[PDB]
Symmetry: D2
Subunit: 445 residues, 4 copies
């Protein structure tokens, strides 16, 4: 069987590029899919009551046709992201609608409109084949992927590709995602695998790490500098588990927000010291459905100042959205920045503009990362400066359960998924660098 | 009488600096004031039902003691600003609340905590006296004032003085404003009077012109460049009457929003062609008290694209606030900027964050201007590149009516006020430059 | 004959996309070429004694194979650039070296490694065919080109493509340039043709205009704002002319430097008023081959201040290099910027660093433009805000003489070349916009 | 004796603000001075043969009159800076030329135009008296002083005070410097003393730490971010000993250049790993005295790449000037920044502009720091994130020897000077924080 021979060559460690080019491609591959017919199955239920285990299937699907500028990748491991969860509960809309509408553009785009949607927006693995015009990547190259799919035909993205008007999120607005044994990506999504990490660890930072890097570190986001005070909501989640690391590695002070003493201890394990538990404080920023309580804004602001010696934060790392956003704007220092990439609790934000203009603050929208920012974020991982935050790993066959844990907030850092990898622990080729950092690497386990 | 002697010297033309130094200072001056006792006379009434004529008094007040780094200015003219309106209807709080609590600091700021409040945040006039440490300005100098009052003892303002924690607005959070025959200002508020303008014209740009300059032109605001498309709310109001000029003079395209065809004609007189009447289009961005209508946002966005050839705006010049802010965020181009210095219609903003993060937009809060920005804005006026926008002039005794007109929105550009100047038309000393630009200078009359 | 039928289709004005798709591609096309065998013919000669008429041949060459993301363009007109002239004298090295070495990379790059090299880095024309993966452009589209050729496989260019490490300049480091009846370009080189211009006018701004735009207008260069004073060396040259237009269109003040009273008249024709004749002033910035004369820097600075009312320039637009650079650093305002894209007089620059650090100045290097900047620069042409500067037009068969003209600086404006266009004056489809700007369009004739 | 009673009050540790206010001011104070007579004395000699011990005098000088916004400070300790060395060798120009022509401005600045010059640009001590208009600082306050003297009457400095046209360096371009028992400073030079440091340690970072902070960390300089590679010339000198710390604490990689293995060991003690010894490597960047050797530039570049895994530096921290500047421009990464605040080896820089424009690099001039940058730099010291780098301390009477050591390169630290402090080791009031950082605090000893 051809898939087993691909895995055997990977595990062998001796296969050269010519060997991979010679290996026969399988005729099908195992993939975690949504089914088009079942897209209304959660109709009328509440969001908590929607169960990804009901809609996620394990299918054998044919290999898509390789186009120019693309690579076929044998996937050793992937991860669950929030966008995967939303996809699995057909929220906010069935991902199938875009796939069909986009597919009518050209024959190449049409490959993605199918009765099934292969999900997954992270990958770690090995290049099998490359389409026409590809020089920078060869069969056998060990890779991770970022999830930005840009065509770059418009000039708009040529000073920062996040401005491309035709940007899709791989595995979400494209098919052939990474929760599968094989994946199709553009070669400009490919990055060198950090050699000191396992397959599942290498696959875990991708989406959240690059997002946090752009949002906090890069000049396209908050432009952090050493000495800054930074409020980090959700500091032990996927995004926060990288944002906290960037604040500390950058010489800044994180004020970490968590919802349980258990999460607080992980932040201390990361090296943070100023930690706020939103439950124990019992913040109620909203009096009712339509009115906020500035007394509760001010109470958050006083709690921050206890940790900073009377200083207000230079940057708020936002993502919870409507519930917290009025407080985020209020507590930010004169001249400071609220940077936002999400609105988990609701996207209709309300805030008092007097604080924004009279104190010269700014709200900066950020989304994923361009290839240079993705490369820089992955490079900091490769250098041992930023660490994966895996808490639990599931086999591909159990992806539905992994999605539900994330949906219900059962875990802390990243939830990983094995794909072709037969067990955890494989893929390390820099044991010296790994052993220097193993304690941090395992801090979320 | 010593006030007449001061005016006669100014009107004369050959008074040297020594002559002004030798003039006797009056023991009192006429000023437009609020009265501490009356500070709640409008409590219980509705916003449109407070008439500033009820709360604005013409009193004779003693001269304050001159301090270090300050100047006593004989005021030839001033203007009404919206903050003057807000002051006169003791809304949102009595300006006395500030004055009172501050004066407890230093005996110098204590001079401002009085039972009356001399209003006014613009001036054009002549320096009479300077306090200790004043080298750049001398008696007899023709000046306009910007309204930034900064102490600059804190380090915070030394990379942009707007960030000074003690940054106040002169005549609003300080006493001895410009709607009076004399005023007290810091000498770092002083700028050279544009020689081609009359006293009342020279006093009209100060507050709104410098604010629009920082908001739209400077790198501390939207950083406009030629080719940009800029949506300008209230394009024929105080702020808009300068923002439109900066867009056109900078090589950009303003899309001007007004509420009457009469105001549309002024915008065409300024050189603009893309004009939207919000009354005629009947935008109703809010369905009910708590929900907006995204179909109305899209309708604005389509109308803009009719003027731009399918392009979305790079910058939104905001200030109306809650009524328009959701639409402003929606219509902005991917990567664009919404810049806001106010919220006339309500400061509790609501917007859909999905548009802000998924299209990488930013909301930038802006407030007045630092001295360098104020100087640059006044310099463009002095060079004839930006023109005053006076529509109507009142005598000092009629300031109450001037404020009512702005309160109810009877006027268009700036409403000016004569102080010591006995009639309009005085104070020009560069007649050739004035003749070059008079048609534009008079565009709002 | 197939080439004639392509031209007939273009001149007809009613050919639809499907019509172009069905046209027969010729077997050969006529092209201006260098010959590998002759690359040593000028060895031993001074630069000004090398004659491009001796090295430039008119050949019939076969059509290259169309690759992914590429377009075959029927070229109506092109222009002579400085890089074309240098290539024609095999300076600084022969262009064949790069074509050979680069051709070793892959079969696609090998297409360019030929015994002949078709030169030309500007184009205006009509798309004939597009390779695999192209949806933005289609047969029949009227285009101009920018000359940046980037693969974008490296992440480096994904936040500003000028940072791409393996960039080529089309027609200089690639084959199939624009001085020919057909050309091969990447589709990410294509821009919409300005409809109000003729073929030869539309082909003229490209390289020099986008370069000046990035250098002066964009935030990657000097970030011009209205009110700035800008010193522009060679203000009537190819580059200095577009810089002068950008200064004026953005509301800044150019201080134009020229070498003759007739060149001063060109600057006045462009709308500039502050003009300095370095020949009349007799500046000798260098006392000998190794020592500069600071008293001559000072003389330039005083003369500048005569035009600005005592103000030093915010920006120096540099390109002459060693001769002028010390003076450019000297005269720049405290906090100002010297932006440089060339060193025509010599690339070993000498300056007094005391002025740079003690007055907090910066020198910013700039080079060509990314696709977004090229689009914005061409869009300002399409809007009628920036105008082509054609001074003389040659037919394709006379390209050798056009190159000599540029080599000996016989013209102040761009030198254009007709390719397929049978005469000047064709290709206008927005005659109303043309009429409005006709006098400016012809200012360099 | 009044001076002795001031020192006793400080050493007692229980003197209140009112006790300092009641202390009798001395009528003279001991100071390190230059003499305007001794003006010319080193002319005709070479730089190394200039002995500061001949030109630096220990005189008794009368107290200057205190002005508005100023403070008289009892100086416990100071430091030697390079500007002290340049002052003492009257080189390039005499500092008297500054002092002298200035004071003819205002009677307040005229106090500084004296026949002697009290040197010193750092201080740690205790406020004794404040002038009119001072609220933020009071007698008894423990302070360090930054050396920025700005008048701020001009608007130019109000968006970054370094742009004030009257910006000066206290103790170098002004009188009453800190190498003395008393000093006169503007209160906007005052910063809170770090409580965990001794007087001499607290005085040592001021000038070079704030300069390195602006140059490397702030957005007004290089804008460092974690992951950047930074080449740091003179990494164990004054400036470099802070620049190296900022690189490491901000998550970047310094490539440190020193001239002895002993200095290399200190860099390793600071936490750096990539270290280049310029003497051992034998770089000779200048062929003759008018020509450089690009083979030597390339050799440095390959040495850097050995440390970075083949990456070129994002930032070069320059200050040696002519000898190294050509290399610095060459080795910088494409799109990178060379930031320079000095030219120790000669201010006539020469560099190859081809590397700057073709690789889109920039040279950014930087000079000291504004009050906000100085506050942020001192705050990082106060938080124990940046440490002082004292190597040796001299008594006030031996300042000439201290100057000579820096002039010839005998030491590596900052070299500190006791003023009123009778011995080393006094002034710590936060011993717990000191203990946490003592090993790093003493790394240069
Ligand atoms: N490129 C983009 O634009 C990206 C967006 N995303 C995100 O997708 C989702 C994933 O974020 P991710 O970190 O991976 O998911 P996680 O669940 O792993 O972490 C999110 C954290 O947010 C906190 N949180 C949730 N709700 C609230 C609330 N109402 N108030 C305060 N805190 C709250 C929780 O931390 P705790 O309970 O401990 O307080 C939670 O753990 C987000 O919605 C965002 O859209 C992610 C990557 C990229
Ligand atoms: N932070 C700062 O430094 C400064 C703030 N301010 C301003 O005070 C307030 C007044 O500004 P100013 O220009 O002098 O006042 P004006 O009244 O002169 O102009 C404001 C314009 O806004 C328009 N407008 C008013 N209400 C609405 C609405 N509900 N929706 C849409 N448009 C509306 C009106 O134009 P039309 O009806 O024709 O559409 C009006 O002309 C500004 O909003 C801001 O607070 C001013 C200067 C500085
Ligand atoms: N980096 C890039 O992307 C680009 C660079 N270029 C440059 O093109 C060439 C120069 O630009 P371009 O304007 O098109 O060429 P032009 O010949 O059309 O103009 C050059 C101008 O330089 C002036 N000049 C030359 N030498 C001196 C001197 N010693 N002192 C003062 N002025 C001098 C002359 O002014 P005189 O007329 O005073 O009156 C001349 O007009 C270079 O080769 C360079 O490559 C061009 C396009 C792009
Ligand atoms: N603009 C501003 O505000 C400031 C400027 N300065 C600068 O001070 C001087 C440097 O400051 P500072 O750090 O206090 O002085 P230091 O003497 O303490 O350190 C300077 C370092 O530069 C190295 N160096 C000296 N000469 C050369 C050379 N020819 N080539 C390469 N490296 C060299 C030396 O290290 P090694 O021998 O180990 O290689 C030396 O340690 C500058 O001249 C200027 O005065 C300083 C502070 C502020």
């Amino acid at each position: 069987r051809h898939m087993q021979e691909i895995l055997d060559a990977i595990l062998s460690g001796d296969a050269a590029s010519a060997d991979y080019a010679a290996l026969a491609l399988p005729e099908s591959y195992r993939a975690v899919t949504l089914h088009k017919g079942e897209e209304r199955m959660f109709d009328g239920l509440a969001s908590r009551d929607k169960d990804p285990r009901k809609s996620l299937h394990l299918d054998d699907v044919p290999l898509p046709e390789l186009g120019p500028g693309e690579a076929l990748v044998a996937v050793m491991a992937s991860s669950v992201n929030y966008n995967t969860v939303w996809s699995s509960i057909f929220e906010p809309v069935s991902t199938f609608g875009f796939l069909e509408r986009y597919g009518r553009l050209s024959p190449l785009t049409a490959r993605h409109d199918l009765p099934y949607h292969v999900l997954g927006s992270d990958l770690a693995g090995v290049v099998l084949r490359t389409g026409a015009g590809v020089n920078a990547w060869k069969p056998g190259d060990e890779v991770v992927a970022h999830c930005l799919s840009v065509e770059l035909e418009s000039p708009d993205g040529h000073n920062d590709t996040m401005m491309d008007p035709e940007q899709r999120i791989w595995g979400f607005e494209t098919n052939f995602g990474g929760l599968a044994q094989l994946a199709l990506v553009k070669t400009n999504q490919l990055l060198p695998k950090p050699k000191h990490l396992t397959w599942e660890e290498a696959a875990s930072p991708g989406l959240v790490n690059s997002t946090a890097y752009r949002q906090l570190v890069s000049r396209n986001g908050a432009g952090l500098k050493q000495g800054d005070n930074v409020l980090i909501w959700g500091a032990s989640g996927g995004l926060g588990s990288y944002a906290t690391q960037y604040a500390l590695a950058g010489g800044a002070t994180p004020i970490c927000v968590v919802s349980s003493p258990r999460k607080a201890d992980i932040c201390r394990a990361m090296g943070a010291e100023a930690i706020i538990d939103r439950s124990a404080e019992g913040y109620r920023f909203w009096k009712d459905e339509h009115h906020q309580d500035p007394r509760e804004w001010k109470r958050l602001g006083g709690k921050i100042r206890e940790f900073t010696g009377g200083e207000d934060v230079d940057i708020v790392f936002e993502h919870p959205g409507r519930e917290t956003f009025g407080a985020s704007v209020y507590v930010t220092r004169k001249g400071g920045t609220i940077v936002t990439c999400a609105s988990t609790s609701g996207y209709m934000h309300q805030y008092d503009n007097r604080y924004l203009w009279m104190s010269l603050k700014r709200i900066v929208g950020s989304h994923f990362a361009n290839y240079r920012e993705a490369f820089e974020a992955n490079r900091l991982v490769a250098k041992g400066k930023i660490h994966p935050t895996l808490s639990k790993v599931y086999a591909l066959e159990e992806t539905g359960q992994a999605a539900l844990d994330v949906h219900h907030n059962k875990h802390q850092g990243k939830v990983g998924v094995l794909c072709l990898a037969p067990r955890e622990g494989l893929g390390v080729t820099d044991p010296e660098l790994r052993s220097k950092h193993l304690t941090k690497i395992n801090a979320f386990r």
